[PDB]
Design a protein around this ligand. Structure first.
Ligand SMILES: [Ca+2]
Ligand SMILES: [Ca+2]
Length: 148
């Protein structure tokens, strides 16, 4: 609840209880990675053991919803931001040439679940297509989603 909305808050909140349900809102750090994953951020084996032994050095071994909520919050940046971004851009491209052509953009955004019309497609492309290419570049695409 550092600076979240409420929906996400209700999320790890619901995940937290469903893991405890014993009259003590404190889950074992050894099972912390599970929640952060169920949330959106996937922790690495290494970072897990460090924060785990960490709590065991004072918090006995289990963590409270406060410290956790504080953690999921700080985890909203360990994704290297652009790293996860480039990952998605690649998904639409399909090839990985650095630019998503109409066929690549529509085919992926439509196959996932968004039934977009060609007209809307030409709109997004043209707006970000600064290089004036028949394709969107990571820079152009990322820009578009950074507002729209
Ligand atoms: Ca491509
Ligand atoms: Ca372009």
């Amino acid at each position: 609840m550092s600076e979240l909305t409420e929906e996400q808050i209700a999320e790890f909140k619901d995940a937290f209880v469903q893991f405890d349900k014993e009259g003590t809102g404190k889950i074992a750090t050894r099972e912390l990675g599970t929640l952060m994953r169920t949330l959106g951020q996937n922790p690495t084996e290494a970072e897990l053991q460090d924060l785990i032994a960490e709590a065991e050095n004072n918090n006995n071994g289990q963590l409270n919803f406060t410290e956790f909520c504080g953690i999921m919050a700080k985890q909203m940046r360990e994704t290297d931001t652009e790293e996860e971004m480039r990952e998605a851009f690649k998904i639409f491209d399909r090839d990985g040439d650095g630019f998503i052509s109409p066929a690549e953009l529509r085919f992926v955004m439509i196959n996932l679940g968004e039934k977009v019309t060609d007209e809307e497609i030409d709109e997004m492309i043209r707006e970000a297509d600064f290089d004036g290419d028949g394709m969107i570049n990571y820079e152009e695409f990322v820009w578009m989603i950074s507002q729209k």
